[PDB]
Design a protein around this nucleic acid. Structure first.
Length: 559
RNA sequence: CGCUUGCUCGGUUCGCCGAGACUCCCCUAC
DNA sequence: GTAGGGGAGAATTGGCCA
DNA sequence: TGGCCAATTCT
């Protein structure tokens, strides 16, 4: 049963007025402002909003929230339900957290009762309501417009829609194709392929980029080409596939080419289809954010044959693979040892049925290719250069007195703090006290006198280590948050490089995962494969391999 | 067998073309 | 460094003037 | 008849 609806983002070409001025946005803002800021008793009283016109009008009358001329029931229901759920999500968040503590207390009490000890006093339960009766953590207002059926997207038509510079194709007629034969474009016409590049051309079904794609003209260190954004925009607008959404007297027109690319690269619809069924592969309820100007369509339930799963654990893995190997005579495996001199190491195998036995025969062992590892290395050489500067010019923004606790105390870590290298870690060895007591007699500015060990041995002999190093100039953990974490984390989301490097990291991890999946498919000669993972690129690679259960439905075992 | 916008990383003879991602949004905290 | 709450339809029916 | 399109409603 398919239950995944991946997004498909499209751009907005023309509007009437900014979406922040639309009545629907104003009503959403007002309802959110009212509902996030009233007490529990008032929320219980102000909870008769219902799902009907006769209830919506009375709720908007006795409360006093301005309706701004917006009276569509089907769009107001979504707003009100979302606002009340966001109000009642903080309460349940706190509730879950208190249950964590409650359970522990119950287990401790029952264990003490079994052992005869009296139950311990239960810790107070935290609550989201302060002395004023409101929530301490008030949810924020969202800039998101949710469309509904009466405002569903339809193909642009000058006979029923406002005139625009661009024109839309006949909805029934097949959608326009790209360049039929790009090798026939003459010199002096856009898209020309020069003679020398002709032998070097990809033979697979690569996605086709138009000449006006700004990825072909973007600012690069070694281009020396010129970017004229106006010419590219006017060339792109003449071949767009426009769709229109009209809410009340306002409207927006989008470029349906994002939907076309999404349906092409996913192998859902072959070239030559019309706009009517292109819009029919997605829901009629897009989501609009005014800040970007992007509409996030979601694929219709059934367009993508993906059944989302969750990573299994323990015996459930055995049940899952015993179920799988009964479906097909061949089942392929891959074991991931991430963190061995290379980002990924894969152990391929197959799974058979010896009646009720998981018989396995290895078919080899591979590592990631050199080019992919080169890409991963080039990412890290750029990440390190980013957290160099997110600290260098972030800790210098100093209040002239807070340096001692965080910044320069690290300088005295090498300054103020013989047998050992004095920096290389040598645990349990007496090399520290061997040289120290070579010029001293069982005495120093500090001692050990620590009951350390399983039996808490009174280790104080020769004053070995872990006491003098500790009382050497430490971090001291003083005013760490305000002077380090707050400043650095505030500047983390300000630079434009840090918001791109995380996406690049995710893309590279997904590239590694996709390569491993493709290789698995090839080596094991199977189309129903499985992944086992037992648990720096470690965290991101683990998340990327663990996201196949949800995004793509591939089973994943946690070991 | 299969590709018109947008995004990431690269090659260039500056006319393009090689490779990749496609589960995304707000939201309060730490 | 991510943690944990909230989101991401559409078929059938009824009032309805033409 | 018949048509356009809000408003029920379930999930």
């Amino acid at each position: 049963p398919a239950n995944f609806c991946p997004p498909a983002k499209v751009n907005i070409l023309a509007q009437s007025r900014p979406l922040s001025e639309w009545p629907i946005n104003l009503v959403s803002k007002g309802v959110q402002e009212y509902v996030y800021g009233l007490t529990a008793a008032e929320r219980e009283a102000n909870g008769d909003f219902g799902t009907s016109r006769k209830s919506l009008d009375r709720w908007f009358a006795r409360t006093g929230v301005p309706t701004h001329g917006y009276t569509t029931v089907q769009g107001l229901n979504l707003i009100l339900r979302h606002t009340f759920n966001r109000y009642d999500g903080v309460i349940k968040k706190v509730e879950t957290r208190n249950e964590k503590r409650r359970s522990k207390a119950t287990r401790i009490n029952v264990s003490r009762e079994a052992d005869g000890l009296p139950p311990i006093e239960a810790e107070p339960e935290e609550t989201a309501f302060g002395p004023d009766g409101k929530l301490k953590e008030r949810p924020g207002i969202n800039p998101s417009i949710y469309c509904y059926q009466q405002v569903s997207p339809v193909p642009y038509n000058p006979a029923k829609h406002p005139a625009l510079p661009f024109s839309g194709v006949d909805p029934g007629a097949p959608l326009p194709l790209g360049t039929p034969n790009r090798l026939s474009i003459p010199k002096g016409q856009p898209g020309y392929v020069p003679e020398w590049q002709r032998p070097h051309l990809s033979t697979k079904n690569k996605r086709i980029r138009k000449w006006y794609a700004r990825a072909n003209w973007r600012r690069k260190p070694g281009r020396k080409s010129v970017l004229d954004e106006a010419k590219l925009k006017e060339a792109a607008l003449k071949e767009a596939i426009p769709i229109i959404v009209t809410i009340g007297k306002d409207w927006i027109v989008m470029d349906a080419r994002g939907l076309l690319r999404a349906v092409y690269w996913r192998g859902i619809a072959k070239p030559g289809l019309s706009l009517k069924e292109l819009l029919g592969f997605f829901s009629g309820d897009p989501v609009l954010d005014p800040k970007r100007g992007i509409a996030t369509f979601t694929f219709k339930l059934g367009a993508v044959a993906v059944h989302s799963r969750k990573p299994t654990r323990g015996k459930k893995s055995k049940e899952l693979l015993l179920s799988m190997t009964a479906e097909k005579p061949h089942v392929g495996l891959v074991a991931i040892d991430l963190g061995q001199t290379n980002p990924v190491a894969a152990e391929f195998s197959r799974v058979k049925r010896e009646g009720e036995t998981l018989q396995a025969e290895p078919l080899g062992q591979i590592v990631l290719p050199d080019d992919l590892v080169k890409d991963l290395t080039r990412y890290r050489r750029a990440w390190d250069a980013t957290e160099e500067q997110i600290k260098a010019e972030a800790i210098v923004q100093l209040p002239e007195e807070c340096r001692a606790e965080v910044v320069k105390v690290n300088q005295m870590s090498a300054e103020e703090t013989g047998d050992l290298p004095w920096e290389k870690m040598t645990s349990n060895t007496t090399f520290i006290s061997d040289h120290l007591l070579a010029k001293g007699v069982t005495d120093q500015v500090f001692f050990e006198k620590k009951s350390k060990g399983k039996k808490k041995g009174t280790e104080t002999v020769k004053r070995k280590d872990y006491g003098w190093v500790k009382l050497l100039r430490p971090r001291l953990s003083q005013e760490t948050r305000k002077a380090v974490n707050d400043k650095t984390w505030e500047l983390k989301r300000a630079s434009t490089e840090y918001v791109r490097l995380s996406r690049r990291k995710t893309e590279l991890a997904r590239r590694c995962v996709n390569y491993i999946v493709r290789e698995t498919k090839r080596w094991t000669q199977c189309e129903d494969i499985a992944i086992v993972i037992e648990d720096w690129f470690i965290q991101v690679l683990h998340k990327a391999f663990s996201d196949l259960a949800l995004h793509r439905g591939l089973p994943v075992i946690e070991a």
